[PDB]
Amino acid sequence: ASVTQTMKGLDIQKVAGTWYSLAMAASDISLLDAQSAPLRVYVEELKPTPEGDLEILFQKWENGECAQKKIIAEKTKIPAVFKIDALNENKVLVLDTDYKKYLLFCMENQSLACQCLVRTPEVDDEALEKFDKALKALPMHIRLSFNPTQLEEQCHI
Amino acid sequence: ASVTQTMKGLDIQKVAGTWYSLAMAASDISLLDAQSAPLRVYVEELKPTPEGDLEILFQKWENGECAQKKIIAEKTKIPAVFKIDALNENKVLVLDTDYKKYLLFCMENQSLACQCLVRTPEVDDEALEKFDKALKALPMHIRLSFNPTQLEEQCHI
């Protein structure tokens, strides 16, 4: 349960702009193992809406290539908790951010995928230490991190 | 470089018998990401030879199924360091063991795959803490662990 790790006092408008998926972790190996694994999503940009929803631009390895993608996570009564409701009720939880270097979030349905986002293509040990604190509380069985060269490539190739 | 983490005073004959690949970690994502990834090897048994070599029985997802496999790692002047020399000179390094619950080893060519082996199908937090200490020193970018149900299945399905 990642609802145990949410950010206090979140200002969503301040997460706007460029991010890099530096590290990813998932409850089930299958969520991240292939390059076409379903939660292997490479964030490009967060765009908070004026009405306070969260647009997420990401890349996804889909049918033999690197696809540009766009979803809208809808605000809730809880500032750190957004909904992507399709066939299933899925949540986006913002765990922690300093707005200007890192952001930790999880996608949750008990199945779960989390990421360490960073503003620039470099290995932020500070950010990764905060990511590992978060995961210590959660039942993850796969963890990936990327190098600065991969971070500057489409779908982290 | 995993040569920095070798076990002092290793008695190879005492590693004989049943092991489970509880956790795996690799320098490069591609070494462990598919189920058919080349270092996704599921140890069954260590068999030290009378002359002091190390036979390793493992399973491997190969050409659409779970293959039984057998290699011989040859002893060196160094008790904790074995060679699997093919086209390339590859090393098996025993990092640490208590003989009766856990064993940490790495396969190394700078590319590297390491495992936390345990004697029985259960999540040994003690063993996994010693594994994470070892990896802290090494440049790993993917980490997997398995649940007791997967550990009792062919190729950890």
Side-chain angles (χ1 to χ4, degrees), chain A residues 39-50 52-105:
Chain A
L39 268 298
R40 272 244 206 142
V41 298
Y42 305 97
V43 172
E44 176 174 311
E45 194 185 347
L46 301 181
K47 301 197 317 195
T49 79
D53 293 330
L54 184 69
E55 286 210 281
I56 316 166
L57 284 73
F58 56 106
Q59 307 168 335
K60 181 75 185 81
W61 197 267
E62 243 185 20
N63 300 291
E65 69 195 20
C66 192
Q68 292 305 150
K69 310 269 302 204
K70 202 157 129 64
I71 56 161
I72 299 210
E74 287 176 351
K75 56 170 179 180
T76 63
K77 289 156 187 273
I78 296 174
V81 176
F82 298 84
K83 60 193 185 276
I84 300 159
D85 290 353
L87 188 54
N88 308 273
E89 317 219 299
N90 300 307
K91 287 187 178 103
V92 172
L93 300 93
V94 184
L95 298 211
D96 189 34
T97 191
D98 76 347
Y99 299 110
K100 74 197 219 301
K101 295 206 177 77
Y102 77 95
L103 186 144
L104 318 181
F105 79 97

Side-chain angles (χ1 to χ4, degrees), chain B residues 11 56 62 64 68 81 85 92 101 112 117 122 128-129 134:
Chain B
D11 188 343
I56 316 166
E62 243 185 20
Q68 292 305 150
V81 176
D85 290 353
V92 172
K101 295 206 177 77
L112 183 68
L117 296 187
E122 47 195 346
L128 292 175
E129 199 185 324

Side-chain angles (χ1 to χ4, degrees), chain B residues 30-50 52-72:
Chain B
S30 51
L31 294 176
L32 288 177
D33 83 328
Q35 96 253 65
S36 68
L39 268 298
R40 272 244 206 142
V41 298
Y42 305 97
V43 172
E44 176 174 311
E45 194 185 347
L46 301 181
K47 301 197 317 195
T49 79
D53 293 330
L54 184 69
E55 286 210 281
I56 316 166
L57 284 73
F58 56 106
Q59 307 168 335
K60 181 75 185 81
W61 197 267
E62 243 185 20
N63 300 291
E65 69 195 20
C66 192
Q68 292 305 150
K69 310 269 302 204
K70 202 157 129 64
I71 56 161
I72 299 210

Side-chain angles (χ1 to χ4, degrees), chain B residues 47-50 52-109 111-148:
Chain B
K47 301 197 317 195
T49 79
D53 293 330
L54 184 69
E55 286 210 281
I56 316 166
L57 284 73
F58 56 106
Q59 307 168 335
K60 181 75 185 81
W61 197 267
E62 243 185 20
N63 300 291
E65 69 195 20
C66 192
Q68 292 305 150
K69 310 269 302 204
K70 202 157 129 64
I71 56 161
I72 299 210
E74 287 176 351
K75 56 170 179 180
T76 63
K77 289 156 187 273
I78 296 174
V81 176
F82 298 84
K83 60 193 185 276
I84 300 159
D85 290 353
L87 188 54
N88 308 273
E89 317 219 299
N90 300 307
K91 287 187 178 103
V92 172
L93 300 93
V94 184
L95 298 211
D96 189 34
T97 191
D98 76 347
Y99 299 110
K100 74 197 219 301
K101 295 206 177 77
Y102 77 95
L103 186 144
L104 318 181
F105 79 97
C106 291
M107 294 154 287
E108 182 196 68
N109 70 355
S111 263
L112 183 68
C114 310
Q115 311 205 343
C116 183
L117 296 187
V118 293
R119 285 302 197 171
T120 66
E122 47 195 346
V123 179
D124 185 343
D125 289 337
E126 164 215 36
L128 292 175
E129 199 185 324
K130 276 142 153 35
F131 190 58
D132 290 323
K133 268 146 189 155
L135 299 183
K136 204 182 74 207
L138 302 169
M140 304 321 225
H141 297 92
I142 177 160
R143 141 63 174 266
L144 311 177
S145 59
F146 295 102
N147 70 32

Side-chain angles (χ1 to χ4, degrees), chain B residues 9-30:
Chain B
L10 177 69
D11 188 343
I12 198 54
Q13 295 297 328
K14 285 167 69 196
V15 313
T18 295
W19 294 97
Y20 295 77
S21 300
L22 171 63
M24 323 186 158
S27 58
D28 302 282
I29 283 153
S30 51

